[PDB]
PDB file of C-alpha atoms in Angstrom:
ATOM      1  CA  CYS U  10     -37.415  89.585 275.135  1.00  0.00           C
ATOM      2  CA  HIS U  11     -35.525  92.778 274.242  1.00  0.00           C
ATOM      3  CA  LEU U  12     -38.102  94.264 276.681  1.00  0.00           C
ATOM      4  CA  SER U  13     -35.524  95.431 279.233  1.00  0.00           C
ATOM      5  CA  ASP U  14     -33.835  97.479 276.469  1.00  0.00           C
ATOM      6  CA  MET U  15     -37.126  98.984 275.329  1.00  0.00           C
ATOM      7  CA  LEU U  16     -37.881  99.948 278.942  1.00  0.00           C
ATOM      8  CA  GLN U  17     -34.584 101.769 279.195  1.00  0.00           C
ATOM      9  CA  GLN U  18     -35.119 103.521 275.795  1.00  0.00           C
ATOM     10  CA  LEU U  19     -38.598 104.581 276.913  1.00  0.00           C
ATOM     11  CA  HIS U  20     -37.346 105.649 280.373  1.00  0.00           C
ATOM     12  CA  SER U  21     -34.708 107.836 278.656  1.00  0.00           C
ATOM     13  CA  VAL U  22     -37.076 109.428 276.081  1.00  0.00           C
ATOM     14  CA  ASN U  23     -39.764 110.185 278.765  1.00  0.00           C
ATOM     15  CA  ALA U  24     -37.007 111.569 281.109  1.00  0.00           C
ATOM     16  CA  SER U  25     -36.030 114.224 278.508  1.00  0.00           C
ATOM     17  CA  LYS U  26     -39.688 115.539 278.609  1.00  0.00           C
ATOM     18  CA  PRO U  27     -39.862 116.010 274.786  1.00  0.00           C
ATOM     19  CA  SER U  28     -43.035 118.039 274.815  1.00  0.00           C
ATOM     20  CA  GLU U  29     -41.727 120.573 277.393  1.00  0.00           C
ATOM     21  CA  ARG U  30     -39.561 122.580 275.041  1.00  0.00           C
ATOM     22  CA  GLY U  31     -39.717 126.157 273.695  1.00  0.00           C
ATOM     23  CA  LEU U  32     -39.350 125.020 270.089  1.00  0.00           C
ATOM     24  CA  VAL U  33     -40.373 121.495 268.974  1.00  0.00           C
ATOM     25  CA  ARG U  34     -38.970 120.046 265.738  1.00  0.00           C
ATOM     26  CA  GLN U  35     -40.627 116.597 265.582  1.00  0.00           C
ATOM     27  CA  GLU U  36     -39.990 116.307 261.790  1.00  0.00           C
ATOM     28  CA  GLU U  37     -36.208 116.352 262.334  1.00  0.00           C
ATOM     29  CA  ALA U  38     -36.477 113.168 264.476  1.00  0.00           C
ATOM     30  CA  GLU U  39     -37.866 111.172 261.510  1.00  0.00           C
ATOM     31  CA  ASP U  40     -35.755 108.245 260.329  1.00  0.00           C
ATOM     32  CA  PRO U  41     -36.918 106.239 257.220  1.00  0.00           C
ATOM     33  CA  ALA U  42     -34.136 103.609 257.758  1.00  0.00           C
ATOM     34  CA  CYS U  43     -35.931 102.580 260.985  1.00  0.00           C
ATOM     35  CA  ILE U  44     -39.400 101.675 259.467  1.00  0.00           C
ATOM     36  CA  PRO U  45     -40.596  98.336 260.897  1.00  0.00           C
ATOM     37  CA  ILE U  46     -40.688  95.213 258.763  1.00  0.00           C
ATOM     38  CA  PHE U  47     -43.443  93.625 260.833  1.00  0.00           C
ATOM     39  CA  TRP U  48     -46.540  94.717 262.726  1.00  0.00           C
ATOM     40  CA  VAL U  49     -49.953  93.342 263.599  1.00  0.00           C
ATOM     41  CA  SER U  50     -52.493  94.538 260.980  1.00  0.00           C
ATOM     42  CA  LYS U  51     -55.552  92.671 262.412  1.00  0.00           C
ATOM     43  CA  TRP U  52     -56.557  90.840 265.534  1.00  0.00           C
ATOM     44  CA  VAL U  53     -59.483  89.013 267.199  1.00  0.00           C
ATOM     45  CA  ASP U  54     -59.688  88.299 270.946  1.00  0.00           C
ATOM     46  CA  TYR U  55     -61.934  85.227 271.423  1.00  0.00           C
ATOM     47  CA  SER U  56     -59.571  83.940 274.088  1.00  0.00           C
ATOM     48  CA  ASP U  57     -62.333  82.856 276.464  1.00  0.00           C
ATOM     49  CA  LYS U  58     -63.327  80.107 274.095  1.00  0.00           C
ATOM     50  CA  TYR U  59     -61.133  79.830 270.912  1.00  0.00           C
ATOM     51  CA  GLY U  60     -57.989  81.847 271.470  1.00  0.00           C
ATOM     52  CA  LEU U  61     -56.372  85.019 270.051  1.00  0.00           C
ATOM     53  CA  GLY U  62     -55.985  85.231 266.273  1.00  0.00           C
ATOM     54  CA  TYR U  63     -53.973  87.797 264.454  1.00  0.00           C
ATOM     55  CA  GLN U  64     -52.667  88.911 261.062  1.00  0.00           C
ATOM     56  CA  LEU U  65     -49.277  90.414 260.369  1.00  0.00           C
ATOM     57  CA  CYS U  66     -48.715  92.994 257.686  1.00  0.00           C
ATOM     58  CA  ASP U  67     -47.221  90.413 255.201  1.00  0.00           C
ATOM     59  CA  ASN U  68     -50.667  88.638 255.346  1.00  0.00           C
ATOM     60  CA  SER U  69     -49.448  85.737 257.456  1.00  0.00           C
ATOM     61  CA  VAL U  70     -51.843  84.649 260.188  1.00  0.00           C
ATOM     62  CA  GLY U  71     -51.349  83.248 263.683  1.00  0.00           C
ATOM     63  CA  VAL U  72     -53.456  81.838 266.529  1.00  0.00           C
ATOM     64  CA  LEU U  73     -52.604  81.527 270.232  1.00  0.00           C
ATOM     65  CA  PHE U  74     -54.813  78.667 271.446  1.00  0.00           C
ATOM     66  CA  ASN U  75     -55.895  78.404 275.097  1.00  0.00           C
ATOM     67  CA  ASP U  76     -53.659  75.360 275.748  1.00  0.00           C
ATOM     68  CA  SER U  77     -50.609  77.682 275.256  1.00  0.00           C
ATOM     69  CA  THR U  78     -49.838  76.301 271.800  1.00  0.00           C
ATOM     70  CA  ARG U  79     -49.448  78.505 268.690  1.00  0.00           C
ATOM     71  CA  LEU U  80     -50.091  77.918 265.014  1.00  0.00           C
ATOM     72  CA  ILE U  81     -48.953  80.180 262.213  1.00  0.00           C
ATOM     73  CA  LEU U  82     -49.845  80.135 258.545  1.00  0.00           C
ATOM     74  CA  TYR U  83     -47.296  81.776 256.232  1.00  0.00           C
ATOM     75  CA  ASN U  84     -48.431  84.165 253.446  1.00  0.00           C
ATOM     76  CA  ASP U  85     -47.971  81.389 250.844  1.00  0.00           C
ATOM     77  CA  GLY U  86     -51.315  80.003 252.196  1.00  0.00           C
ATOM     78  CA  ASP U  87     -49.961  76.546 252.855  1.00  0.00           C
ATOM     79  CA  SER U  88     -46.796  76.394 255.023  1.00  0.00           C
ATOM     80  CA  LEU U  89     -47.427  76.085 258.748  1.00  0.00           C
ATOM     81  CA  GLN U  90     -45.257  76.562 261.800  1.00  0.00           C
ATOM     82  CA  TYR U  91     -46.628  74.814 264.960  1.00  0.00           C
ATOM     83  CA  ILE U  92     -45.250  75.814 268.361  1.00  0.00           C
ATOM     84  CA  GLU U  93     -45.894  73.446 271.263  1.00  0.00           C
ATOM     85  CA  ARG U  94     -46.038  74.058 275.035  1.00  0.00           C
ATOM     86  CA  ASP U  95     -42.324  73.338 275.486  1.00  0.00           C
ATOM     87  CA  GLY U  96     -41.418  75.605 272.564  1.00  0.00           C
ATOM     88  CA  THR U  97     -40.757  72.749 270.125  1.00  0.00           C
ATOM     89  CA  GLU U  98     -41.351  74.038 266.573  1.00  0.00           C
ATOM     90  CA  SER U  99     -42.456  71.920 263.630  1.00  0.00           C
ATOM     91  CA  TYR U 100     -43.253  72.373 259.888  1.00  0.00           C
ATOM     92  CA  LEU U 101     -46.363  71.122 258.331  1.00  0.00           C
ATOM     93  CA  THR U 102     -48.638  72.083 255.351  1.00  0.00           C
ATOM     94  CA  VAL U 103     -52.347  72.674 255.008  1.00  0.00           C
ATOM     95  CA  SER U 104     -52.495  70.782 251.683  1.00  0.00           C
ATOM     96  CA  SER U 105     -51.085  67.604 253.347  1.00  0.00           C
ATOM     97  CA  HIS U 106     -54.115  67.484 255.638  1.00  0.00           C
ATOM     98  CA  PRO U 107     -52.013  66.383 258.636  1.00  0.00           C
ATOM     99  CA  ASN U 108     -53.750  63.825 260.903  1.00  0.00           C
ATOM    100  CA  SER U 109     -52.627  65.426 264.189  1.00  0.00           C
ATOM    101  CA  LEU U 110     -53.627  69.068 263.649  1.00  0.00           C
ATOM    102  CA  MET U 111     -56.862  69.319 261.581  1.00  0.00           C
ATOM    103  CA  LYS U 112     -58.942  70.822 264.370  1.00  0.00           C
ATOM    104  CA  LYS U 113     -56.391  73.536 265.101  1.00  0.00           C
ATOM    105  CA  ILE U 114     -55.851  74.211 261.313  1.00  0.00           C
ATOM    106  CA  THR U 115     -59.633  74.507 260.895  1.00  0.00           C
ATOM    107  CA  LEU U 116     -59.856  77.004 263.826  1.00  0.00           C
ATOM    108  CA  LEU U 117     -57.034  79.021 262.243  1.00  0.00           C
ATOM    109  CA  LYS U 118     -59.033  79.108 258.954  1.00  0.00           C
ATOM    110  CA  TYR U 119     -62.095  80.445 260.848  1.00  0.00           C
ATOM    111  CA  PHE U 120     -59.925  83.200 262.309  1.00  0.00           C
ATOM    112  CA  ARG U 121     -58.274  83.846 258.855  1.00  0.00           C
ATOM    113  CA  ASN U 122     -61.646  84.103 257.144  1.00  0.00           C
ATOM    114  CA  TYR U 123     -63.098  86.313 259.853  1.00  0.00           C
ATOM    115  CA  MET U 124     -60.247  88.794 259.724  1.00  0.00           C
ATOM    116  CA  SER U 125     -60.453  88.853 255.954  1.00  0.00           C
ATOM    117  CA  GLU U 126     -64.140  89.586 255.555  1.00  0.00           C
ATOM    118  CA  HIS U 127     -64.612  91.856 258.670  1.00  0.00           C
ATOM    119  CA  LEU U 128     -61.483  93.891 259.511  1.00  0.00           C
ATOM    120  CA  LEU U 129     -59.386  96.788 258.299  1.00  0.00           C
ATOM    121  CA  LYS U 130     -55.715  96.199 257.563  1.00  0.00           C
ATOM    122  CA  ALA U 131     -53.705  98.448 259.881  1.00  0.00           C
ATOM    123  CA  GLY U 132     -50.800 100.246 258.366  1.00  0.00           C
ATOM    124  CA  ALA U 133     -51.818  99.296 254.791  1.00  0.00           C
ATOM    125  CA  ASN U 134     -50.218 102.512 253.552  1.00  0.00           C
ATOM    126  CA  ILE U 135     -46.800 101.666 255.040  1.00  0.00           C
ATOM    127  CA  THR U 136     -44.048 100.124 252.919  1.00  0.00           C
ATOM    128  CA  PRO U 137     -41.840  97.954 255.225  1.00  0.00           C
ATOM    129  CA  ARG U 138     -38.072  98.277 255.389  1.00  0.00           C
ATOM    130  CA  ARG U 145     -37.498  85.308 260.232  1.00  0.00           C
ATOM    131  CA  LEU U 146     -41.156  85.745 260.795  1.00  0.00           C
ATOM    132  CA  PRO U 147     -42.075  86.785 264.376  1.00  0.00           C
ATOM    133  CA  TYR U 148     -45.062  85.437 266.354  1.00  0.00           C
ATOM    134  CA  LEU U 149     -47.176  86.937 269.073  1.00  0.00           C
ATOM    135  CA  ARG U 150     -45.271  86.171 272.309  1.00  0.00           C
ATOM    136  CA  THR U 151     -47.438  88.032 274.823  1.00  0.00           C
ATOM    137  CA  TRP U 152     -50.550  90.218 274.756  1.00  0.00           C
ATOM    138  CA  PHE U 153     -53.145  91.831 277.026  1.00  0.00           C
ATOM    139  CA  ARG U 154     -56.062  94.258 276.809  1.00  0.00           C
ATOM    140  CA  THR U 155     -56.734  97.302 278.995  1.00  0.00           C
ATOM    141  CA  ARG U 156     -59.798  99.613 278.814  1.00  0.00           C
ATOM    142  CA  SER U 157     -57.735 101.973 276.663  1.00  0.00           C
ATOM    143  CA  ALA U 158     -55.583  99.695 274.423  1.00  0.00           C
ATOM    144  CA  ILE U 159     -54.330  96.328 273.390  1.00  0.00           C
ATOM    145  CA  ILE U 160     -50.615  95.620 273.904  1.00  0.00           C
ATOM    146  CA  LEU U 161     -48.871  93.211 271.570  1.00  0.00           C
ATOM    147  CA  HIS U 162     -45.429  91.844 272.224  1.00  0.00           C
ATOM    148  CA  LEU U 163     -43.847  90.186 269.156  1.00  0.00           C
ATOM    149  CA  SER U 164     -41.016  87.575 269.304  1.00  0.00           C
ATOM    150  CA  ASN U 165     -38.642  89.859 267.420  1.00  0.00           C
ATOM    151  CA  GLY U 166     -38.694  92.291 270.320  1.00  0.00           C
ATOM    152  CA  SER U 167     -41.368  94.578 268.928  1.00  0.00           C
ATOM    153  CA  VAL U 168     -44.089  95.964 271.141  1.00  0.00           C
ATOM    154  CA  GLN U 169     -47.217  97.270 269.422  1.00  0.00           C
ATOM    155  CA  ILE U 170     -49.882  99.311 271.237  1.00  0.00           C
ATOM    156  CA  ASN U 171     -53.266  99.967 269.556  1.00  0.00           C
ATOM    157  CA  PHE U 172     -55.358 102.712 271.222  1.00  0.00           C
ATOM    158  CA  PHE U 173     -59.025 101.900 271.148  1.00  0.00           C
ATOM    159  CA  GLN U 174     -60.889 105.282 271.297  1.00  0.00           C
ATOM    160  CA  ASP U 175     -58.978 107.221 268.615  1.00  0.00           C
ATOM    161  CA  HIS U 176     -57.390 104.293 266.699  1.00  0.00           C
ATOM    162  CA  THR U 177     -53.824 105.704 267.096  1.00  0.00           C
ATOM    163  CA  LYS U 178     -50.991 103.162 267.264  1.00  0.00           C
ATOM    164  CA  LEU U 179     -47.409 102.811 268.378  1.00  0.00           C
ATOM    165  CA  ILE U 180     -44.905 100.303 266.966  1.00  0.00           C
ATOM    166  CA  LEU U 181     -41.851 100.116 269.132  1.00  0.00           C
ATOM    167  CA  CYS U 182     -38.609  98.445 268.081  1.00  0.00           C
ATOM    168  CA  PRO U 183     -35.902  98.101 270.621  1.00  0.00           C
ATOM    169  CA  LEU U 184     -33.370  96.930 267.953  1.00  0.00           C
ATOM    170  CA  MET U 185     -33.630 100.180 266.017  1.00  0.00           C
ATOM    171  CA  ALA U 186     -34.428 102.081 269.224  1.00  0.00           C
ATOM    172  CA  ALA U 187     -37.321 103.642 267.299  1.00  0.00           C
ATOM    173  CA  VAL U 188     -40.971 104.282 267.415  1.00  0.00           C
ATOM    174  CA  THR U 189     -43.573 104.338 264.563  1.00  0.00           C
ATOM    175  CA  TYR U 190     -46.668 106.453 265.312  1.00  0.00           C
ATOM    176  CA  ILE U 191     -49.926 106.062 263.342  1.00  0.00           C
ATOM    177  CA  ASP U 192     -52.215 108.988 264.006  1.00  0.00           C
ATOM    178  CA  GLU U 193     -56.012 109.235 263.845  1.00  0.00           C
ATOM    179  CA  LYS U 194     -55.955 110.093 260.162  1.00  0.00           C
ATOM    180  CA  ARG U 195     -53.864 106.974 259.366  1.00  0.00           C
ATOM    181  CA  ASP U 196     -50.719 109.091 258.784  1.00  0.00           C
ATOM    182  CA  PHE U 197     -47.490 107.372 259.894  1.00  0.00           C
ATOM    183  CA  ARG U 198     -44.108 108.489 260.893  1.00  0.00           C
ATOM    184  CA  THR U 199     -41.027 106.606 262.150  1.00  0.00           C
ATOM    185  CA  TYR U 200     -38.777 108.330 264.700  1.00  0.00           C
ATOM    186  CA  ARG U 201     -35.436 107.446 266.195  1.00  0.00           C
ATOM    187  CA  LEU U 202     -35.952 107.731 270.043  1.00  0.00           C
ATOM    188  CA  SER U 203     -32.663 109.459 270.671  1.00  0.00           C
ATOM    189  CA  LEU U 204     -33.554 112.087 268.049  1.00  0.00           C
ATOM    190  CA  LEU U 205     -36.930 112.624 269.824  1.00  0.00           C
ATOM    191  CA  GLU U 206     -34.891 113.393 272.998  1.00  0.00           C
ATOM    192  CA  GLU U 207     -32.952 116.019 271.013  1.00  0.00           C
ATOM    193  CA  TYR U 208     -35.674 117.694 268.891  1.00  0.00           C
ATOM    194  CA  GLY U 209     -38.799 117.088 271.012  1.00  0.00           C
ATOM    195  CA  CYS U 210     -42.398 116.082 269.956  1.00  0.00           C
ATOM    196  CA  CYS U 211     -46.036 117.070 270.378  1.00  0.00           C
ATOM    197  CA  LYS U 212     -48.069 116.441 273.547  1.00  0.00           C
ATOM    198  CA  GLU U 213     -50.015 113.748 271.755  1.00  0.00           C
ATOM    199  CA  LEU U 214     -46.945 111.566 270.988  1.00  0.00           C
ATOM    200  CA  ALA U 215     -45.374 112.322 274.415  1.00  0.00           C
ATOM    201  CA  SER U 216     -48.291 111.055 276.486  1.00  0.00           C
ATOM    202  CA  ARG U 217     -48.567 107.901 274.369  1.00  0.00           C
ATOM    203  CA  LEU U 218     -44.909 107.143 275.004  1.00  0.00           C
ATOM    204  CA  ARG U 219     -45.539 107.723 278.727  1.00  0.00           C
ATOM    205  CA  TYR U 220     -48.326 105.077 278.622  1.00  0.00           C
ATOM    206  CA  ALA U 221     -46.107 102.751 276.557  1.00  0.00           C
ATOM    207  CA  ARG U 222     -43.525 102.789 279.366  1.00  0.00           C
ATOM    208  CA  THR U 223     -46.231 101.789 281.871  1.00  0.00           C
ATOM    209  CA  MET U 224     -47.203  98.974 279.573  1.00  0.00           C
ATOM    210  CA  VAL U 225     -43.642  97.681 279.069  1.00  0.00           C
ATOM    211  CA  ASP U 226     -43.251  97.921 282.952  1.00  0.00           C
ATOM    212  CA  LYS U 227     -46.370  95.801 283.141  1.00  0.00           C
ATOM    213  CA  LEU U 228     -45.077  93.154 280.607  1.00  0.00           C
ATOM    214  CA  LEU U 229     -41.871  92.869 282.582  1.00  0.00           C
ATOM    215  CA  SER U 230     -43.654  92.700 285.937  1.00  0.00           C
ATOM    216  CA  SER U 231     -46.042  89.977 284.765  1.00  0.00           C
ATOM    217  CA  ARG U 232     -43.050  87.613 284.179  1.00  0.00           C
TER     218      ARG U 232
ATOM    219  CA  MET I   2     -63.255  92.170 271.185  1.00  0.00           C
ATOM    220  CA  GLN I   3     -61.629  92.621 267.712  1.00  0.00           C
ATOM    221  CA  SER I   4     -59.542  95.181 265.736  1.00  0.00           C
ATOM    222  CA  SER I   5     -61.099  97.951 263.711  1.00  0.00           C
ATOM    223  CA  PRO I   6     -63.757  96.753 261.173  1.00  0.00           C
ATOM    224  CA  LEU I   7     -64.415  97.431 257.454  1.00  0.00           C
TER     225      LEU I   7
END
């Protein structure tokens, strides 16, 4: 998961109370070497009938079907990775029109086309630094929480469109504000230099959400 | 629900 590590990193950053300082030097916590490679740019929750479909920033698409299987289309528009209930992975292609999986491939195309003609690409202004899939997700009233197979946890806030991309490997957070401006901070440096109340409260909620992910296991 | 629209 890498989730336990993220919890500890978030516990530590929140413990330092970064917004409760005389002087706050948020800019000094910025680290461009820690910019994420992957994040979810688009998603669609039709899980009550079809499943959850998503797009990653590299333009690859994925669908979590209700039978707990997953299908991903790579950004070459043809290569597929199909993950079964038991975690068995297999390679197929759209162009081969595979007997077994046409119905699921067609559903993915529906998702793909919907996201393409309806939805904004999140973090389109970010240049990034094995392809991950969506391992776990849930929605609250305030946000959607997206746990990727590379350890990343993404949190999209509904009301103001602000977003957090948390990486436990870099021990880093990327924050996208309401004006689509993005920064990448090393968490240990946020402990040292501090941050605004806006980022601080979102990191507090993030910890609750990681606690939730870990407790739902 | 879906992500933010065009």
